[PDB]
Amino acid sequence: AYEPQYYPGNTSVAQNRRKHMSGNVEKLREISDEDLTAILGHRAPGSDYPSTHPPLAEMGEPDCPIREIVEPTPGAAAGDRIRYVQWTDSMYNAPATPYWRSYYAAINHRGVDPGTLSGRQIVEARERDVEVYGKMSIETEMTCPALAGLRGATVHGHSCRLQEDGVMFDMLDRRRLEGGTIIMDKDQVGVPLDRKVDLGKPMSEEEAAKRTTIYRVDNVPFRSDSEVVEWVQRIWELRTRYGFQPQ
Amino acid sequence: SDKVDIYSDRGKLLASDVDIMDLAPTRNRAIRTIIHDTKRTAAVNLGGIEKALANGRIGKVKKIPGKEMKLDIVANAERLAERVKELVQVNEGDDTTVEVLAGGKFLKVQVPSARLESGAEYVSSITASAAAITQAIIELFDVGIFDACMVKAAVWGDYPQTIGLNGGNVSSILEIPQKDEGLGFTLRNIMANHIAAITQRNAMNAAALSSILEQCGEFEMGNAIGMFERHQLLGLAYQGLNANNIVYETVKEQGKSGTIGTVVHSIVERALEDGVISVDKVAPSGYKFYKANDVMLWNAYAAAGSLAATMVNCGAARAAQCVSSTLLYFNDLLEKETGLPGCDYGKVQGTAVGFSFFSHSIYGGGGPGVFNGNHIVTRHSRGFAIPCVAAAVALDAGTQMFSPEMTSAVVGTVYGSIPEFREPIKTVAASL
Amino acid sequence: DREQLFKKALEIKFTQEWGENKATEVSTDITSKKAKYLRLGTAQSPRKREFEQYGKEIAAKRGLPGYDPKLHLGGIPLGQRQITPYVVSSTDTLCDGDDLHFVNNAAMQQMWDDIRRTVIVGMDLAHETLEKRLGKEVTPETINHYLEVLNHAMPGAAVVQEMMVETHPGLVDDCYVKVFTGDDELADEIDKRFLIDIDKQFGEEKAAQIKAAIGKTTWQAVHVPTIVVRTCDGATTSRWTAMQIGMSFIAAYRMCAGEAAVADLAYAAKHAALVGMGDMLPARRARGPNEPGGLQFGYLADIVQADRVTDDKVKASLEVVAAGAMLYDQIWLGSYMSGGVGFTQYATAAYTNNILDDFSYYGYEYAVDKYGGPAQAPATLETVKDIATETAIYAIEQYEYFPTLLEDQFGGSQRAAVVAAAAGIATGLATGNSQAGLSGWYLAQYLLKEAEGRLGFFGYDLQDQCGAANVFSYQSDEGLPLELRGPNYPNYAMNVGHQGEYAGIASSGHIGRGDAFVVNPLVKVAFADPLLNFDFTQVRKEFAKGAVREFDRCAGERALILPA
Amino acid sequence: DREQLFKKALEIKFTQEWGENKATEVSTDITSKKAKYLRLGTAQSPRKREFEQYGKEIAAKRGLPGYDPKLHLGGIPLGQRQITPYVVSSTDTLCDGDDLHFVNNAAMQQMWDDIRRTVIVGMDLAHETLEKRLGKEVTPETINHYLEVLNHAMPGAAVVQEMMVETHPGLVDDCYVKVFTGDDELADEIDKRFLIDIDKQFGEEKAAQIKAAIGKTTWQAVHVPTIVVRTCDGATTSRWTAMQIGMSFIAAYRMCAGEAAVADLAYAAKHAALVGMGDMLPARRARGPNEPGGLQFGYLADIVQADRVTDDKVKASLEVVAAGAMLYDQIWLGSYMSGGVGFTQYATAAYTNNILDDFSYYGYEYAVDKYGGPAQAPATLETVKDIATETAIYAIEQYEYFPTLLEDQFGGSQRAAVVAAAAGIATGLATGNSQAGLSGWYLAQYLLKEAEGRLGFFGYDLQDQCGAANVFSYQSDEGLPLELRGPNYPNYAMNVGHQGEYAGIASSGHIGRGDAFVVNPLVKVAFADPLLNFDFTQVRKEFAKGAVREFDRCAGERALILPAK
Ligand code: F43
Ligand SMILES: C[C@@H](OP(=O)(O)O)[C@H](NC(=O)CCCCCCS)C(=O)O
Ligand SMILES: O=S(=O)(O)CCS
Ligand SMILES: O=S(=O)(O)CCS
Ligand SMILES: [K+]
């Protein structure tokens, strides 16, 4: 037996980082299957998932011992196209941080291709699998609909000052606070939708500060989580020493 | 079938009735051992490593202040050689050798065959030697984590910022594969100064070692397939290995008062006497146009003649520079004398035209010693030009700035300590 | 309380109107996390309006369109967020970020041309050739005559043949050759018009250190025409130099104009006594010598000359960072290795708004107080851990205390380059060991990642995750002192936000020690020359001049051969 | 009696005063072996006086001297012999030889920049990636929108990110992308502003030949900014092109701005569907792609476009020679591989005074009369021996009938390049085989050597003595059709007076046959574009414009970002 520990630290930030890593995240809002498909912009809502169409020479399944013992995901078994879910998260205590959305995906979802950047975080996977991931990425506490936004392009905003209404700037205006709720009426690449998708209320400033995986000097300073600073120094020192002589 | 008698650097019979196929790089055991040792042997310049460490210097001009580590290296050459052998060898008692030379300044390292057999190229001779000496010095002086990078720089130079060990202290008779002009040029990228230093300035052995390496290069290039195998082997035997004593006896006959032109006349007289050429037709003026009864054998006589003329002309002046003009005018005058193409059907003469230009102008090149079979100036002939350059460099009595004593002290000492490299004609003949 | 050095710049660039961005309506408080988004687009920016206007003229003239702000994704032009200017660090120049794009900045192009068009060629082996082969005497009189001939010939003018056609001197007036020597007796006899006087250019201690490293050797600092390297490439420089050195020796010493000894002078100038700016690159990113990829970090530190004229150690190291961030990220990675809009702001993060200055002065001042002074801290992992952690966490917190600072350096790679450069430079200056500084850079990168839950762009930290292990490795393609690393060091060959900062770290150990040079004393002396078009003692001031279209030493233009 | 085409130019350049050279006192007879040497030096030449005066200003401003005519060996300045001008062949422009130095001629620099800054990139594999991998539809509408986006982005302008800083369009207005296709149905649907119409640019027969070679494929003719290749190098071009193609596909097809499929578009633009101007060079003369050394002789023939607009076969071949002699000898061998005063007149010999024109028209007219017409002479050594000997001996004798011709082409390498180019081009045009032309070039070289008892400079004939044997060799580093040879072909890698002439010979077989292109139909179509700064249909006319400082399409200047004058 083995009980995963995930990450060091004892502050609310470290506790939230372990929640995102372990998948122990609270559900705070609901999105319908068709509204999720509409905002991802890969196919018409309600339509069946299209398949890949590879050349004749690649249709044959090879005799492979690994293919025989690794079960394909539902998306891989159906031959879905590879599609994506990309998020931008404010540095003003958006619950999510790019590395921790990638750790959440790597630990809790099969057959995923996560990518971490400062202003965007992506997960590519077989379309139906990426929608299962996408639903959890938007319904859970990993998202605040004001401090975060699905953006497959023109991502600028993670490090910008918030708007006067507390919403993170979006050059393409895909979602905004409209009459007491967050409305997303364009897909993740800015194409206007023929519907309004209601992403619900934003988190309060206090809730975001309590649920965030980002450290901030005016909330939970990075300097205050001694075990995390120690862990960094330990990895740096051991990598340095073993690079010279691995003993 | 083509047969030859192989004669020594002193014109003495060494082997009779030798099939030229048995002298091929692909069949001759001595040539295969020379190439095997060329690929597995590297030189570690302990003297260079010592000065680089003591002064924080990398190559000729780079110096990082505050990095001086005045480690005592040269005086510890035998202890370091023992540790380098332990690190370079694959198994105890295998074919690895490490020898101290030049009073501790150099190590000759011969990596075991196993490193070449599991590698694609010869470069493990450099990398295993460089890694071995770096580790041995770190151990002997208990060099700490912060300072080991300066031991690394003292051995490997600017690598990996540079493609090779630029400014380092581990080298070979060969240059890195990335410097090859095309496919099969590695054994052609060897300075004529290296050959002359290795063969102790014995002009016949300098031409022989160069001809062996050049023809190994021509074979690896794909220029000795089908009918071209006979073509290149006749050139190797007659120009490189003194077949039928033509090179030595022509030089002896023309040594006292001969010139480039009298060597041309001697070669035409000999080709006619041996039945290699005959009169084709006589012009109204009486000028005789000759025909080649055996084109490849005529080419080989012109290759032998090109070398004999170099020895007579450069030998008389005791000056290497005459080789570029000798290769040009021996072949130009040979064509004017007979109406037949010169060596390599104009390519020795053509190589000599550019070689003369690039050894007497502002644009590049240098003295004869810097040229090689991979040099853009001298690559054009199919291995028939550089053997003459190696002989010419050997015959120089002190006219050159960039002499073998200036450019080839390390290689000359390391590879010159191996008998097969010093005496290639004798070694080739004895392996038959 | 220490007043952060960037606050003045943040007040100017965010709270004072620039163009028609209505800055006072966006926010007047540099600590406010909120701002009023006016979405002014093109209308707020005279610079974007200039580009839009030229785009209309171009489309009309060619019948094929070009620049059009409305072709931005969704038909929404740049400037939905407030467009702000930049203060070039250490200057009072305020400019648009477009004015710092290498294409739009003649000072930046001229800085690269002055490096590209330079090689250093020894004279000793050439003089020895003349003595050995011709029995010629070399004296200060023959050398001075040779230098007059050389400065006529080098730009492309004839000295031997009849009926030669020549370059227009007005197109090549940036081309010249100066000399320097470690032989003080020879230096006192060289014609002062051509001499780089080591005693005048460097302080007593540094001049002695240079002379001891150079010995009694003599060198030519050659600068071929900018128009030639622009028409051709960096690999042209050593060949162009050798051709005119060869002609000048022929004419000045009355040699035969093409004899065997001339080939020895050619081999000496092109190979044996040549000291270029960098060697070739491998097949995938193939280039010949004298290209940015071959320029070792220590060479860029020796090209820059701020340390020669200022005792402010942090300032001198950051002038190296500015030259390197521009050359390596904007020109090299942003054009030679990629292109398009490129990487202006990945580099400007390291030379604007006094931000890297604030972080570096903080770390260095902390180290001076704790360890005593420059080059006094032990070169150990304990010292690196202390200085780099202190400096990195201070820098991390500044982006959180100042939302305007975070919005200015909006990309994580910009924050990573600046946070880690300050940690590395403070560590290098304090220990006098640039390898200790490099170790500090990687520790700072790791701290930033865990602090913000993000680091740089997708591929930013390939070299940083490889980094800690490869600082002190002695393995074949891993080990190397930082001074000799460069853009061809495998881990460093692809990514922005590292190379220029590494040039500053390479300089830091040496600046901490008060060394005259970092890796090549010949390079240091060759660039200690006020006649060079770019002023290498004041890199940031020169970039600021180029930004406002006031840099007046741009070479290589063809106005003289074009219609009026 | 046939009137030699160079006589009018010799009369003008030698017997009519140029500057203050007192030409009528030197000699008024172009056939006279004697001349009165006045030793006027600098005073005769307004151009040398201009250089002298700039030299004094430079010395005064810098405190470090420069140009000084009196630093010529012995204190004797250039011009002890009469300084004469040159007529640019096929033009009425008379200029100083210094006006044809590449440094002093903006048309020459712009010709090289237009080649250096160009690559051709296929669209089919990118469109297939969009359809198969992303399930996106590619239509003429999406392509046309992509091309508008691409022409905004390519010069250095943003399309996805916020707060981007961009290149000044006024500095990069020479940058654009056009397209061409062998799919006629698609050609009729592409936005005409971006199309290179193959039917309009080429005759009916040539357009059909191009379309059959290209097939139903579509290509982008990309021209990155001149200022970029001048600041950087030719190896920048394919990378700059791919970056902005990638951004334009992301924006025009609304892809994720950085997903796995984007890497397939990058690999297609940079590698699988890239058609550059030339590959890299080996270590000794190391350079990346798109440098003159990598430019195959057939590529230079396909870049030049005179054959597309004139039916005069010799004239079309000699426009190729002019482009090649300038690029390969003046810029490439004379600067990239050497430098200094360089090799202006080694190249001008092939494009001045209608001399090469006289010799080539003579040889070609001889071959047309004897064999019937272009591409009708058998491609045999008998034909090569006949045409090349007839042309070479005629050319050799012209230097002896006209002492002014011999004084004009004073260097033996100049005589060798022109005598052999005429023999090679006449042979190539007559046989329709450029390899037969190459064989003729080497025979002419050998005839000239025995005729004058001299050939070229010290190292001129390395490739010519190697030459005859290597024309038809099939050995590893010897064999290759001339169209695929270039400045990196081993024998050719070092010497002046051959490469540009070989580009003309490479063109000659194909011009003789009436072929639309020589070696790459994509290159031929990409340069059949009047929007390019250099007019590739009239090479010599463009060089003449540059010589008199009237070339008005020079790109890459920085006047807009420099203080006002
Ligand atoms: C399409 C890519 C993927 C790729 O391969 N390159 C891109 C785009 C490319 C283009 C954008 C030009 C344009 O807008 O048309 C250029 C300028 C390169 C070019 N072709 O000239 C560039 N990036 Ni990018 N790129 C940058 C950056 C960034 C930051 C921006 C995050 C933010 O919050 O704004 C993120 C990476 C990250 O998250 O860490 C980023 C991503 C991306 N970068 C995403 C687009 C993101 C988006 O959809 O908005 N870049 C930076 O972090 C700052 C410097 C900036 C570069 C331009 C400059 O230096 O001035 C530019 C460097
Ligand atoms: C030979 C070689 O020079 P090195 O021998 O390598 O110095 C070569 N130069 C050249 O080929 C010069 C060609 C141009 C000048 C001569 C024109 S005939 C080069 O620089 O790579
Ligand atoms: O988004 S990516 O990190 O791939 C490129 C940033 S410039
Ligand atoms: O005299 S040489 O043939 O070496 C050079 C002529 S440019
Ligand atoms: K250039």
mmCIF file of N, CA, C and O in Angstrom, chain D residues 392-430:
data_model
loop_
_atom_site.group_PDB
_atom_site.id
_atom_site.type_symbol
_atom_site.label_atom_id
_atom_site.label_comp_id
_atom_site.label_asym_id
_atom_site.label_seq_id
_atom_site.Cartn_x
_atom_site.Cartn_y
_atom_site.Cartn_z
ATOM 1 N N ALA D 392 35.105 30.060 -80.583
ATOM 2 C CA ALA D 392 36.288 30.453 -79.822
ATOM 3 C C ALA D 392 37.347 31.118 -80.705
ATOM 4 O O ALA D 392 37.876 32.155 -80.315
ATOM 5 N N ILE D 393 37.659 30.538 -81.883
ATOM 6 C CA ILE D 393 38.699 31.126 -82.732
ATOM 7 C C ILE D 393 38.251 32.486 -83.266
ATOM 8 O O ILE D 393 39.060 33.417 -83.301
ATOM 9 N N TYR D 394 36.956 32.649 -83.602
ATOM 10 C CA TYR D 394 36.438 33.960 -84.031
ATOM 11 C C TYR D 394 36.669 34.998 -82.907
ATOM 12 O O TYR D 394 37.178 36.083 -83.177
ATOM 13 N N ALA D 395 36.302 34.641 -81.674
ATOM 14 C CA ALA D 395 36.427 35.533 -80.524
ATOM 15 C C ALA D 395 37.891 35.869 -80.237
ATOM 16 O O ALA D 395 38.231 37.046 -80.070
ATOM 17 N N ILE D 396 38.776 34.864 -80.263
ATOM 18 C CA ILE D 396 40.229 35.050 -80.064
ATOM 19 C C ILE D 396 40.769 36.095 -81.049
ATOM 20 O O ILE D 396 41.501 36.997 -80.650
ATOM 21 N N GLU D 397 40.384 35.978 -82.320
ATOM 22 C CA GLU D 397 40.863 36.897 -83.349
ATOM 23 C C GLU D 397 40.360 38.330 -83.157
ATOM 24 O O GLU D 397 41.057 39.256 -83.584
ATOM 25 N N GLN D 398 39.183 38.536 -82.526
ATOM 26 C CA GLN D 398 38.649 39.890 -82.352
ATOM 27 C C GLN D 398 39.556 40.753 -81.466
ATOM 28 O O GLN D 398 39.790 41.924 -81.788
ATOM 29 N N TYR D 399 40.163 40.150 -80.432
ATOM 30 C CA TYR D 399 41.116 40.886 -79.581
ATOM 31 C C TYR D 399 42.361 41.345 -80.371
ATOM 32 O O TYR D 399 43.008 42.308 -79.972
ATOM 33 N N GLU D 400 42.701 40.643 -81.466
ATOM 34 C CA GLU D 400 43.864 40.933 -82.294
ATOM 35 C C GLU D 400 43.514 41.942 -83.395
ATOM 36 O O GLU D 400 44.335 42.802 -83.708
ATOM 37 N N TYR D 401 42.293 41.863 -83.968
ATOM 38 C CA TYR D 401 41.839 42.862 -84.946
ATOM 39 C C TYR D 401 41.587 44.209 -84.261
ATOM 40 O O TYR D 401 41.720 45.242 -84.912
ATOM 41 N N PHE D 402 41.179 44.202 -82.979
ATOM 42 C CA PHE D 402 40.872 45.427 -82.266
ATOM 43 C C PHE D 402 41.716 45.579 -80.994
ATOM 44 O O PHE D 402 41.311 45.099 -79.940
ATOM 45 N N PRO D 403 42.851 46.296 -81.063
ATOM 46 C CA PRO D 403 43.644 46.545 -79.853
ATOM 47 C C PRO D 403 42.859 47.204 -78.715
ATOM 48 O O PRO D 403 43.162 46.941 -77.551
ATOM 49 N N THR D 404 41.845 48.037 -79.032
ATOM 50 C CA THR D 404 40.998 48.638 -77.992
ATOM 51 C C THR D 404 40.171 47.554 -77.279
ATOM 52 O O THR D 404 39.948 47.661 -76.078
ATOM 53 N N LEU D 405 39.738 46.500 -77.998
ATOM 54 C CA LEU D 405 38.996 45.406 -77.371
ATOM 55 C C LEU D 405 39.900 44.694 -76.359
ATOM 56 O O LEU D 405 39.464 44.383 -75.253
ATOM 57 N N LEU D 406 41.157 44.454 -76.742
ATOM 58 C CA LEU D 406 42.121 43.783 -75.878
ATOM 59 C C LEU D 406 42.440 44.644 -74.642
ATOM 60 O O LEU D 406 42.562 44.113 -73.546
ATOM 61 N N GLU D 407 42.570 45.965 -74.822
ATOM 62 C CA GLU D 407 42.833 46.875 -73.706
ATOM 63 C C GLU D 407 41.613 46.973 -72.761
ATOM 64 O O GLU D 407 41.781 47.117 -71.553
ATOM 65 N N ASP D 408 40.391 46.907 -73.311
ATOM 66 C CA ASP D 408 39.181 46.938 -72.496
ATOM 67 C C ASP D 408 39.135 45.697 -71.592
ATOM 68 O O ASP D 408 39.031 45.833 -70.379
ATOM 69 N N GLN D 409 39.264 44.495 -72.183
ATOM 70 C CA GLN D 409 39.247 43.239 -71.415
ATOM 71 C C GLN D 409 40.712 42.872 -71.207
ATOM 72 O O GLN D 409 41.245 41.906 -71.757
ATOM 73 N N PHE D 410 41.372 43.725 -70.413
ATOM 74 C CA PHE D 410 42.814 43.647 -70.187
ATOM 75 C C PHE D 410 43.295 42.400 -69.451
ATOM 76 O O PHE D 410 44.451 42.006 -69.652
ATOM 77 N N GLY D 411 42.459 41.813 -68.605
ATOM 78 C CA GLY D 411 42.832 40.619 -67.866
ATOM 79 C C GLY D 411 42.510 39.378 -68.672
ATOM 80 O O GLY D 411 41.421 39.281 -69.251
ATOM 81 N N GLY D 412 43.427 38.421 -68.707
ATOM 82 C CA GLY D 412 43.203 37.174 -69.427
ATOM 83 C C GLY D 412 41.973 36.421 -68.956
ATOM 84 O O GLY D 412 41.275 35.823 -69.775
ATOM 85 N N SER D 413 41.662 36.487 -67.641
ATOM 86 C CA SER D 413 40.467 35.816 -67.119
ATOM 87 C C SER D 413 39.190 36.428 -67.709
ATOM 88 O O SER D 413 38.182 35.742 -67.793
ATOM 89 N N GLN D 414 39.204 37.734 -68.028
ATOM 90 C CA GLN D 414 38.057 38.399 -68.635
ATOM 91 C C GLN D 414 37.872 37.821 -70.047
ATOM 92 O O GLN D 414 36.767 37.438 -70.415
ATOM 93 N N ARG D 415 38.968 37.727 -70.823
ATOM 94 C CA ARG D 415 38.938 37.163 -72.168
ATOM 95 C C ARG D 415 38.470 35.701 -72.109
ATOM 96 O O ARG D 415 37.620 35.300 -72.905
ATOM 97 N N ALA D 416 38.997 34.917 -71.167
ATOM 98 C CA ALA D 416 38.625 33.514 -71.030
ATOM 99 C C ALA D 416 37.134 33.345 -70.731
ATOM 100 O O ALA D 416 36.467 32.553 -71.401
ATOM 101 N N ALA D 417 36.593 34.109 -69.765
ATOM 102 C CA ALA D 417 35.177 33.994 -69.415
ATOM 103 C C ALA D 417 34.247 34.291 -70.604
ATOM 104 O O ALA D 417 33.267 33.590 -70.798
ATOM 105 N N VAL D 418 34.572 35.321 -71.392
ATOM 106 C CA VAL D 418 33.749 35.775 -72.514
ATOM 107 C C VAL D 418 33.896 34.852 -73.740
ATOM 108 O O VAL D 418 32.897 34.480 -74.364
ATOM 109 N N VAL D 419 35.127 34.479 -74.085
ATOM 110 C CA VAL D 419 35.384 33.571 -75.221
ATOM 111 C C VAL D 419 34.662 32.227 -74.967
ATOM 112 O O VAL D 419 33.918 31.740 -75.834
ATOM 113 N N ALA D 420 34.865 31.658 -73.771
ATOM 114 C CA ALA D 420 34.265 30.376 -73.436
ATOM 115 C C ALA D 420 32.749 30.463 -73.222
ATOM 116 O O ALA D 420 32.051 29.520 -73.602
ATOM 117 N N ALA D 421 32.219 31.587 -72.670
ATOM 118 C CA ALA D 421 30.765 31.714 -72.511
ATOM 119 C C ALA D 421 30.094 31.721 -73.883
ATOM 120 O O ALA D 421 29.096 31.046 -74.063
ATOM 121 N N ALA D 422 30.667 32.447 -74.863
ATOM 122 C CA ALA D 422 30.098 32.488 -76.204
ATOM 123 C C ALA D 422 30.100 31.082 -76.839
ATOM 124 O O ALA D 422 29.089 30.666 -77.395
ATOM 125 N N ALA D 423 31.212 30.340 -76.719
ATOM 126 C CA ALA D 423 31.305 28.995 -77.279
ATOM 127 C C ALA D 423 30.277 28.065 -76.602
ATOM 128 O O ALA D 423 29.580 27.338 -77.302
ATOM 129 N N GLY D 424 30.160 28.147 -75.278
ATOM 130 C CA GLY D 424 29.235 27.307 -74.530
ATOM 131 C C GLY D 424 27.774 27.620 -74.814
ATOM 132 O O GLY D 424 26.969 26.705 -75.008
ATOM 133 N N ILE D 425 27.418 28.908 -74.855
ATOM 134 C CA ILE D 425 26.028 29.331 -75.101
ATOM 135 C C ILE D 425 25.614 29.018 -76.531
ATOM 136 O O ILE D 425 24.505 28.519 -76.752
ATOM 137 N N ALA D 426 26.484 29.294 -77.528
ATOM 138 C CA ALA D 426 26.156 28.949 -78.925
ATOM 139 C C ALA D 426 25.910 27.432 -79.063
ATOM 140 O O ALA D 426 24.933 27.019 -79.672
ATOM 141 N N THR D 427 26.737 26.623 -78.401
ATOM 142 C CA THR D 427 26.613 25.168 -78.433
ATOM 143 C C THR D 427 25.339 24.694 -77.704
ATOM 144 O O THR D 427 24.641 23.821 -78.207
ATOM 145 N N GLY D 428 25.043 25.278 -76.557
ATOM 146 C CA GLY D 428 23.862 24.897 -75.788
ATOM 147 C C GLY D 428 22.581 25.257 -76.524
ATOM 148 O O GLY D 428 21.656 24.450 -76.584
ATOM 149 N N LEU D 429 22.517 26.466 -77.097
ATOM 150 C CA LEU D 429 21.336 26.891 -77.850
ATOM 151 C C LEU D 429 21.144 25.994 -79.079
ATOM 152 O O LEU D 429 20.017 25.615 -79.402
ATOM 153 N N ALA D 430 22.238 25.694 -79.790
ATOM 154 C CA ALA D 430 22.142 24.897 -81.020
ATOM 155 C C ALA D 430 21.712 23.453 -80.766
ATOM 156 O O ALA D 430 20.940 22.910 -81.561
#
